[PDB]
Amino acid sequence: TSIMAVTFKDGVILGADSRTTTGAYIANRVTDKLTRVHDKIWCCRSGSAADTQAIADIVQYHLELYTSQYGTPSTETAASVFKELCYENKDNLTAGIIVAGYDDKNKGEVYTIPLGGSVHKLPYAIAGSGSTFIYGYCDKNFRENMSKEETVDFIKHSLSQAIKWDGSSGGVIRMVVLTAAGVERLIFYPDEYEQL
Amino acid sequence: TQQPIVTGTSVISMKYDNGVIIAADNLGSYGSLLRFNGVERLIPVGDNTVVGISGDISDMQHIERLLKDLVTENAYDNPLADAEEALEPSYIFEYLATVMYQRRSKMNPLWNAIIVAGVQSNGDQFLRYVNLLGVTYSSPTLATGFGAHMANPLLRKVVDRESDIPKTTVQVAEEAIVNAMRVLYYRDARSSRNFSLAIIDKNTGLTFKKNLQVENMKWDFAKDIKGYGT
Amino acid sequence: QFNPYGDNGGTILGIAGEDFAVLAGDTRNITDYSINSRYEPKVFDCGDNIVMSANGFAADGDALVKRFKNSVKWYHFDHNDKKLSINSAARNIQHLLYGKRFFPYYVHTIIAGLDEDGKGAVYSFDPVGSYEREQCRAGGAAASLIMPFLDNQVNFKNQYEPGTNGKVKKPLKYLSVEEVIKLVRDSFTSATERHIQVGDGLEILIVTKDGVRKEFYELKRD
Amino acid sequence: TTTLAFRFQGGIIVAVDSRATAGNWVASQTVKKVIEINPFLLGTMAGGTVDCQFWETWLGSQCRLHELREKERISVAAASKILSNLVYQYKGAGLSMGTMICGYTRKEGPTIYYVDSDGTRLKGDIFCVGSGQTFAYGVLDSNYKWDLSVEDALYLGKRSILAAAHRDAYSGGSVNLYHVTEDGWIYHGNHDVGELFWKVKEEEGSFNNVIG
Amino acid sequence: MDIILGIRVQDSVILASSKAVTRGISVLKDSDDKTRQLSPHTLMSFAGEAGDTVQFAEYIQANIQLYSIREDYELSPQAVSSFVRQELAKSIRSRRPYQVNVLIGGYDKKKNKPELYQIDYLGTKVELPYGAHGYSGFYTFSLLDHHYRPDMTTEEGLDLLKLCVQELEKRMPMDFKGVIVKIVDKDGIRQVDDF
Amino acid sequence: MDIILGIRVQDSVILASSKAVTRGISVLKDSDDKTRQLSPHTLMSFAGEAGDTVQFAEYIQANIQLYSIREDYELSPQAVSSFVRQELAKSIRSRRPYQVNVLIGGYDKKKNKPELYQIDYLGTKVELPYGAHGYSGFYTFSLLDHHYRPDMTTEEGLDLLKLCVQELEKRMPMDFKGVIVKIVDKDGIRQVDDF
Amino acid sequence: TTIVGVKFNNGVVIAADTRSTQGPIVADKNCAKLHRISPKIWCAGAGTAADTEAVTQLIGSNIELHSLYTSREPRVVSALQMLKQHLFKYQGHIGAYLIVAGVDPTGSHLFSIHAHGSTDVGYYLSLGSGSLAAMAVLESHWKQDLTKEEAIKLASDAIQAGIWNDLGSGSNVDVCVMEIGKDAEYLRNYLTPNVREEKQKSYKFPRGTTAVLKESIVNICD
Amino acid sequence: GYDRALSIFSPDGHIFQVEYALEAVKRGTCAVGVKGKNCVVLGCERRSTLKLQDTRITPSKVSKIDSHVVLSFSGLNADSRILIEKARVEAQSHRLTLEDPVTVEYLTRYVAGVQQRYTQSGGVR
Amino acid sequence: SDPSSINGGIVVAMTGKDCVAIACDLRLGSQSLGVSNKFEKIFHYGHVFLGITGLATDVTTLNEMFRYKTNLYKLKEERAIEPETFTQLVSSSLYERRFGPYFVGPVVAGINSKSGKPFIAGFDLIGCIDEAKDFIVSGTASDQLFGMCESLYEPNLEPEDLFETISQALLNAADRDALSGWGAVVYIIKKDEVVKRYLKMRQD
Numbered sequence A: 001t002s003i004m005a006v007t008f009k010d011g012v013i014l015g016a017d018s019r020t021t022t023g024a025y026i027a028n029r030v031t032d033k034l035t036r037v038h039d040k041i042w043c044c045r046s047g048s049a050a051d052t053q054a055i056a057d058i059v060q061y062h063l064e065l066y067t068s069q070y071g072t073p074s075t076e077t078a079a080s081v082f083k084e085l086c087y088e089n090k091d092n093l094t095a096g097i098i099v100a101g102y103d104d105k106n107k108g109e110v111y112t113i114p115l116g117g118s119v120h121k122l123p124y125a126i127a128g129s130g131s132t133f134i135y136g137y138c139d140k141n142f143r144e145n146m147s148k149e150e151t152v153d154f155i156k157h158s159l160s161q162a163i164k165w166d167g168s169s170g171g172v173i174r175m176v177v178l179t180a181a182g183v184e185r186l187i188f189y190p191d192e193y194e195q196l
Numbered sequence B: 001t002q003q004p005i006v007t008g009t010s011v012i013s014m015k016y017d018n019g020v021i022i023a024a025d026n027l028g029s030y031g032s033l034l035r036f037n038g039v040e041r042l043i044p045v046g047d048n049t050v051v052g053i054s055g056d057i058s059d060m061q062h063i064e065r066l067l068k069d070l071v072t073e074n075a076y077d078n079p080l081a082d083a084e085e086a087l088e089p090s091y092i093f094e095y096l097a098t099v100m101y102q103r104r105s106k107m108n109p110l111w112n113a114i115i116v117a118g119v120q121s122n123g124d125q126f127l128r129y130v131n132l133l134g135v136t137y138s139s140p141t142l143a144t145g146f147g148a149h150m151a152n153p154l155l156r157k158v159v160d161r162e163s164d165i166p167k168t169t170v171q172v173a174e175e176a177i178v179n180a181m182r183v184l185y186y187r188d189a190r191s192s193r194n195f196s197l198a199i200i201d202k203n204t205g206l207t208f209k210k211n212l213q214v215e216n217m218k219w220d221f222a223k224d225i226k227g228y229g230t
Numbered sequence C: 001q002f003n004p005y006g007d008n009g010g011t012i013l014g015i016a017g018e019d020f021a022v023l024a025g026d027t028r029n030i031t032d033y034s035i036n037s038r039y040e041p042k043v044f045d046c047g048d049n050i051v052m053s054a055n056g057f058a059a060d061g062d063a064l065v066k067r068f069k070n071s072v073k074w075y076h077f078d079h080n081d082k083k084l085s086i087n088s089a090a091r092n093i094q095h096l097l098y099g100k101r102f103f104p105y106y107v108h109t110i111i112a113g114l115d116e117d118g119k120g121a122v123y124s125f126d127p128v129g130s131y132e133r134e135q136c137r138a139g140g141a142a143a144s145l146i147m148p149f150l151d152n153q154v155n156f157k158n159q160y161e162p163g164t165n166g167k168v169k170k171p172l173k174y175l176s177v178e179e180v181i182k183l184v185r186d187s188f189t190s191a192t193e194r195h196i197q198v199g200d201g202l203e204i205l206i207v208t209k210d211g212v213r214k215e216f217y218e219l220k221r222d
Numbered sequence D: 001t002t003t004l005a006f007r008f009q010g011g012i013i014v015a016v017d018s019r020a021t022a023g024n025w026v027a028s029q030t031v032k033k034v035i036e037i038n039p040f041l042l043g044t045m046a047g048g049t050v051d052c053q054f055w056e057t058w059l060g061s062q063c064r065l066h067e068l069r070e071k072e073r074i075s076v077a078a079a080s081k082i083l084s085n086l087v088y089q090y091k092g093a094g095l096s097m098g099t100m101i102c103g104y105t106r107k108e109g110p111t112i113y114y115v116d117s118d119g120t121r122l123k124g125d126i127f128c129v130g131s132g133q134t135f136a137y138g139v140l141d142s143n144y145k146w147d148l149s150v151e152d153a154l155y156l157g158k159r160s161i162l163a164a165a166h167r168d169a170y171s172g173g174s175v176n177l178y179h180v181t182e183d184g185w186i187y188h189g190n191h192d193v194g195e196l197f198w199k200v201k202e203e204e205g206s207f208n209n210v211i212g
Numbered sequence E, F: 001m002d003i004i005l006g007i008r009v010q011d012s013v014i015l016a017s018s019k020a021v022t023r024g025i026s027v028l029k030d031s032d033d034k035t036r037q038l039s040p041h042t043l044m045s046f047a048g049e050a051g052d053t054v055q056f057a058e059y060i061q062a063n064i065q066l067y068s069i070r071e072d073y074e075l076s077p078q079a080v081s082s083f084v085r086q087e088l089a090k091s092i093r094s095r096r097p098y099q100v101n102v103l104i105g106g107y108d109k110k111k112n113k114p115e116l117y118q119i120d121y122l123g124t125k126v127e128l129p130y131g132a133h134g135y136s137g138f139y140t141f142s143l144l145d146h147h148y149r150p151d152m153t154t155e156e157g158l159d160l161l162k163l164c165v166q167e168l169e170k171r172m173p174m175d176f177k178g179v180i181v182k183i184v185d186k187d188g189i190r191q192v193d194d195f
Numbered sequence G: 001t002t003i004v005g006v007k008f009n010n011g012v013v014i015a016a017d018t019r020s021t022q023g024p025i026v027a028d029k030n031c032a033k034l035h036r037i038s039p040k041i042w043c044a045g046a047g048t049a050a051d052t053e054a055v056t057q058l059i060g061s062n063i064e065l066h067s068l069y070t071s072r073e074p075r076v077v078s079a080l081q082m083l084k085q086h087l088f089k090y091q092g093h094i095g096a097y098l099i100v101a102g103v104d105p106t107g108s109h110l111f112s113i114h115a116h117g118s119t120d121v122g123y124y125l126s127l128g129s130g131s132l133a134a135m136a137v138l139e140s141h142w143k144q145d146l147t148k149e150e151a152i153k154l155a156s157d158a159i160q161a162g163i164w165n166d167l168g169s170g171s172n173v174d175v176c177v178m179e180i181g182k183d184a185e186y187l188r189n190y191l192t193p194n195v196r197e198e199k200q201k202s203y204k205f206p207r208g209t210t211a212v213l214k215e216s217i218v219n220i221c222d
Numbered sequence H: 001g002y003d004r005a006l007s008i009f010s011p012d013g014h015i016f017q018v019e020y021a022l023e024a025v026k027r028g029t030c031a032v033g034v035k036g037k038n039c040v041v042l043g044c045e046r047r048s049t050l051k052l053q054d055t056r057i058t059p060s061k062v063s064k065i066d067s068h069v070v071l072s073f074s075g076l077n078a079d080s081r082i083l084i085e086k087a088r089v090e091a092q093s094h095r096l097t098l099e100d101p102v103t104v105e106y107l108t109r110y111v112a113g114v115q116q117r118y119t120q121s122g123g124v125r
Numbered sequence I: 001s002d003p004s005s006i007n008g009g010i011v012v013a014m015t016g017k018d019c020v021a022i023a024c025d026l027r028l029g030s031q032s033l034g035v036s037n038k039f040e041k042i043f044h045y046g047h048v049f050l051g052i053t054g055l056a057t058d059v060t061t062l063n064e065m066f067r068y069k070t071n072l073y074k075l076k077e078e079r080a081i082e083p084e085t086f087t088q089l090v091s092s093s094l095y096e097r098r099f100g101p102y103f104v105g106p107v108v109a110g111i112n113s114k115s116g117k118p119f120i121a122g123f124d125l126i127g128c129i130d131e132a133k134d135f136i137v138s139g140t141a142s143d144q145l146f147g148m149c150e151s152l153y154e155p156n157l158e159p160e161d162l163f164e165t166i167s168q169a170l171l172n173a174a175d176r177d178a179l180s181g182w183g184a185v186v187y188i189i190k191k192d193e194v195v196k197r198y199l200k201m202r203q204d
């Protein structure tokens, strides 16, 4: 996997590749690693496919039950539920999750949750095996309060490089835009991003 | 006792009516890191043989040097070095097969899988495989690594037995090879889009094609796929 | 850690008659769950009316056959073109195999031909060089399937004369080349059905005083 | 394997089975486990087939070279010691052998030497070697006397192998008998356990554990 | 523990069991009785892991004695052997299994027949004319195959048994300090004092 | 191999060595002589790994016999023991060491004194009034500490030795099939046939 | 095993080979790998044979009870959810690898489930030892907007690739077509391209050949 | 290593080095062997130009090879020691492998073989 | 220490024209040591026959367990259990011990009393059903039995002819396996008669 989430002026954008592997065989080349836990709270999944799916399903259940009683949960609340599962079951889990959501009060927020189950609130986050190759690039190129088009280009260029160098990453680049306007899905194919 | 460091993936090949085709991508992987992109893994020997090599690249470069030196040694005191006493594909193979088995027998192998493709002096198609264990075999289609699992099934639909070889043209054969290379790019995590292809024909001779790319790819259906279940 | 051995599958079968001997073997070559070749012969005419097959790890099999073929060549050079008898070949092969007692050829070896009285002969070897002359031997992946069938049909084991209260055994007799080839073909079609490493094609080598003939038959390719 | 050889009034009896196994797979029922070294010397084979076969055949070559060089048949003691010194050189390398060198000479008389692959060499009157040695010992010891006749001794040897062939899963096939006298060794036939078991059961009245 | 034998003849069952108890390089005792009377016409010998053997034997003894008092009736050797087998069959899949092998010799008063059962620690039961546990069988079975007849007397059985002990004393590596022999027949259980 | 003992008394050295040769669950022989005469007044008993024992003993025997012929003279027990020790001391750092333990009993004709040397497979030499190798020592040493006196006769030494064999036969786990006893004194080496 | 699933115009089709192995031995030459979870939800299973049968029957049972409870035709996502949560709970120890397909009031669906409890969505999928041979064919010939007859052809061709090229797969091709608005049609032995040839000889023994010791009538009645 | 062929043929077919070795034997003190019906006796000459000798310690002319075989000689004294040593070692080696002492014929055959080897080996006389 | 090959043994079953046959060897051993030559591996519950190979203690335990279960079945159902139904019961029972299994290789054989159809089935140790038209094999010489049955078998054999075929399949397979043999039993099963025959075989 290569995954990332980036806050910007109007909200936050999540990004991911589409490759799932068993050793060197690609079990699925069109995977969707960006998943909904609430209307405007989404997550990027890295690590074990089974573990991250099981976790995301449980979180979705918790936030649905939260909404029924207390109304819309904050992005921080969602990250806390992810943490609780990842931390308490750290011995039996291989899951690197990035949580991203849009409030109207708090605007765009990004929380990253590594293997240990620690929580880290950041302006932007990167994760997955392919992220190692773009720490240098992303640090040099990230700016706060970017526009939508700038952030899409930042994510597209970043994941393009991650995909290029990481064998465990590839396929299409999926993205999910979270703003006050709503939820927008984007896709970008190899023929475009490879020759960037 | 070794472990392979910088590696090359599948080499694929098949016979057709007048000759043989062989192909391999231009990638040099360093584990999961796709380190080197300008690596040529098809090495011609004379104008009648191409040796395709997968596995460890340091050992591939050693084998290159051996073949290069073999050409030099054959030319010594040999007036017919470019005629009757030129290096045949069968000679080049048997030499490599000997080396591979001797190295495995000394518990210090050349960590490779090799396919020698070419045309003999009498016009007969030559295509044979050898690997780090010294295991050798021949078939109308041959492939290494992931190619063995994914390419061979596709190539065997064209040439399933011996009698299917005369019925297979160079146009049909190359189409199948190029298709197989696309499939490997979809499914092999240590493959690249860029590759080389070589044709050895009994009439038109050796044609070496560099800087080819996988194209006409189907990715559009990906946009419709959402989630993992619900 | 590097493993110098591998398994190339396949199976072989030798039967001896009165004035002939057959050595059969399938043409399939495999590694793990993949097919390498549907036609890769492993039964070879070695000269002096001796046919040989070394089934198991193909690299060791080819090496051994290659060395024995070469042994026959040097036998002619050193002993005035004398014909190498099947019993002499067998003893020579034991020394080839035992020479690598502490890093063995991983193969089951079978040779066939005629003895010095003109009668059919089959010898079989373990990987390190033990050998024994027999009327009948199956070797390789499907040996455990075929061998008991041969005990029953070639050597008439567990078969008694009807009505004799299980007191008189079915008498031993030589089989015709026609009857033997029937048994070989049936043995391999049965082995192909129940063993995954066996199939594609069957190649039989028949050995009479007139020379070495070949016969080929198709086998199921799944 | 099950092999035995014992010394008695009328010379030496040697008896062996004919089975060969690879794990639980019965590979052969017709293996010759006695090697004829010369008209006066026998060698028995137990353990690794090839190890025994190869080196006892080699032993015969060394014995032939002795009588060419010395103009005299080799002693049983000297023959056994050639084999034991050889395997001792390979000690630790993984050879697997349990052999018995049996024969008659003028100076020694009837003699039996046990030789194995960890270098042990023992002179003795009775030995049983192999996976079914204990079964053979049980019958042999309980019926052995020095004053046995040639006829009775041949039968006891045969009967002891049959006992082991029955109980030991890795012994069977057929019994090969040998009698060694002052004049040399004499072969007393191949006896298939298939027919021999029932013949012995009926005539002797033994093997009541088996369904008749 | 080590050597336990059993022979069923015409009218009785004879059990022989070694007297030695060894631990390390010391024979701690040379007069150990490796048997328990389960009922007046049923005897069980045992061999195996230290501690487990006696604990198991006495546990079975208690259960059979309980049954006898409750029903005022003696269980058949067949019934006792099945009970014992099931207990071992349970044991083998426990947290810590009983590592005990037993022979059960009994006289069925309803059938007027002697019966010998051999049960290993896994719970593998077989009825036999003669039986043994451990390395003993590797010598005695072949010997009995030859010399045993089904119509033998108790005296003939004891001579047959002497032949087994002599062979073991000749070819076994360890000194097992002789055997205690006991006979089970229509009149119950008794011990042979001079063997 | 297993039991080898040695006792030095006033005028002689007495060596006792077990007769059993066991392999697996079978006693292959019960009359084995675990000793070699190195010279007319020097005897060496041995015990250890199969094959190694006899190979080593005979190799030493050959070397001492060679010396005797060359010099027309018998080496002293002390000199022989030192030669033996050095050979074992070389062996222990070889590719495959001799796993053999020995006792060397001799009578020094120049000193008119009996001498007993105990040497293990590492090449550890000690001169002793009484010695043993293997598990035997764990019983015999304490027994000899009590009953041994330095001025004993050969007959007193044999009775003392009978006491050791009796104790071993009572408390040792394995049947070692008795011992062969040999005496070394001013008149050379002789065997006691009835023990 | 080789198993596949393919989506088309008005529904979904799944297929499978019919070989069951026991190491290198073919235990069953014509076993049924297509399982019915509900009338219009079918399952193809690879991996541990007992686990695939047991897990499919359990969820099939609970789906039936659920369907009766809710008075609704069962949905594929319900079977998918129940299967994955069961398999996840056992951390991969239940070796079931499934392709789940079917039609329901929501529409047509195609999923795969792995032993550790991960699920995938797709238009074409393949699982089992011959999945690479099958996926090669699917990747070469699959397109959007397949017809019923085109999808059956593509599915069976993908299975055939496994049958011929994978040693783990063989024998026949089973198919199940699940179209919207219609009953699901289970096509057992849709293709039989591996028929055993006539044997060379009849092995019918003369009556009395086998030696017998005892005869006795057995009582089955009360 | 010193390789020179010292023992070689001459035009007349003689090996002079071997024949000159016989002259050394002819110079040596006389030795005689006589065998009776139940015994053998070895007699040896000792030259009397050497007085003030110590006969206790002076090397004896007759040497035991084993307890049952003896060897006397004529020629170079220093050379004889090398043959005697080899013979003594071979005697013990024979007992070790054959479990029987050497015959007199065998021991002779061995010593003679050693002498022969020194007539067609390089670097030796 | 491989539970399925400590004791040894084999079972084979075949179908014929309106009949079925099931056969087994008689050996029970402890590795190399042969212990008993009277250990039958075929049992029956009404007209349904069950053969079980593998670890002997589990063979005994399972027989006792299925006798237990079929007796309660008959009391409640008021009819004998049929082969197809019994097959499902065996499968359920074995899979119940999925992560602590009985080390066995059972084989069901019998004729359905209603339809008259011959039926055989085989299982692995954890309960996977293996149904077959022709034959089922099990035990330490299963490879041998597979080879014998595949070559010797033909469809629609008469009861007398079927006996010869199954007996030869078992005997020759047993003789190539060290842990199998020491006697043999064959059951011929027609609609309403069942013949049991003991075979003469080599006792080594």
Ligand SMILES: *[C@@](C)(CO)[C@](*)(O)[C@H](CC(C)C)NC(=O)[C@H](Cc1ccccc1)NC(=O)[C@H](CC(C)C)NC(=O)[C@H](CCc1ccccc1)NC(=O)CN1CCOCC1
Pocket: A001, A002, A019, A020, A021, A022, A023, A027, A031, A033, A045, A046, A047, A048, A049, A050, A051, A052, A094, A128, A129, A130, A168, A169, G114, G116, G118
């Ligand atoms: C990139 C690839 C790396 O970070 C991404 O993180 C993606 C995340 C997406 C899919 C959410 N990760 C994967 O694709 C993931 C890589 C991986 C593999 C193993 C452990 C952790 C991560 N792949 C998987 O989870 C696959 C998905 C299957 C093929 C549908 N699963 C496996 O590879 C399973 C997992 C077993 C497992 C191990 C440890 C923890 C949890 C589960 N492994 C196998 O099937 C084993 N296989 C047997 C045959 O030999 C090859 C290995």
Ligand SMILES: *[C@@](C)(CO)[C@](*)(O)[C@H](CC(C)C)NC(=O)[C@H](Cc1ccccc1)NC(=O)[C@H](CC(C)C)NC(=O)[C@H](CCc1ccccc1)NC(=O)CN1CCOCC1
Pocket: C104, C126, C127, C128, C130, D001, D002, D019, D020, D021, D022, D023, D025, D027, D028, D031, D033, D045, D046, D047, D048, D049, D050, D052, D096, D130, D131, D170, D171
């Ligand atoms: C009784 C019968 C059993 O112990 C006897 O002891 C006989 C002695 C007779 C044959 C002289 N012993 C055997 O039968 C002996 C048992 C044995 C096996 C292995 C090691 C030690 C002892 N069997 C053999 O030696 C067989 C004989 C063959 C079947 C003709 N040979 C093998 O098992 C060989 C070689 C074994 C080996 C020894 C040392 C180094 C390497 C290998 N192995 C194979 O053939 C391998 N195997 C055959 C089945 O297919 C898979 C590969």
Ligand SMILES: *[C@@](C)(CO)[C@](*)(O)[C@H](CC(C)C)NC(=O)[C@H](Cc1ccccc1)NC(=O)[C@H](CC(C)C)NC(=O)[C@H](CCc1ccccc1)NC(=O)CN1CCOCC1
Pocket: G001, G002, G019, G020, G021, G022, G023, G027, G028, G031, G033, G045, G046, G047, G048, G049, G050, G052, G095, G128, G129, G168, G169, I004, I103, I104, I105, I123, I124, I125, I126, I128, I129, I130
């Ligand atoms: C292709 C053919 C291979 O991938 C398919 O995937 C099929 C799936 C179909 C049949 C549902 N797979 C198999 O056929 C499968 C291959 C296999 C084997 C072992 C582990 C995983 C997969 N075969 C089986 O499951 C067989 C079914 C038989 C033919 C009835 N079962 C076995 O081979 C069992 C395995 C049982 C098992 C227990 C615990 C963990 C994993 C597996 N093995 C045995 O019966 C062997 N042995 C015989 C002696 O008695 C003890 C058990």
Ligand SMILES: [Cl-]
Pocket: A020, A031, A032, A049, A053, B228, G118, G119
């Ligand atoms: Cl996923």
Ligand SMILES: [Mg+2]
Pocket: C221, C222, G162, G163, G164, G165, G166, G167, G168, G169, G170
């Ligand atoms: Mg296939």
Ligand SMILES: [Mg+2]
Pocket: D164, D165, D166, D167, D168, D169, D170, D171, D172, I203, I204
């Ligand atoms: Mg046997």
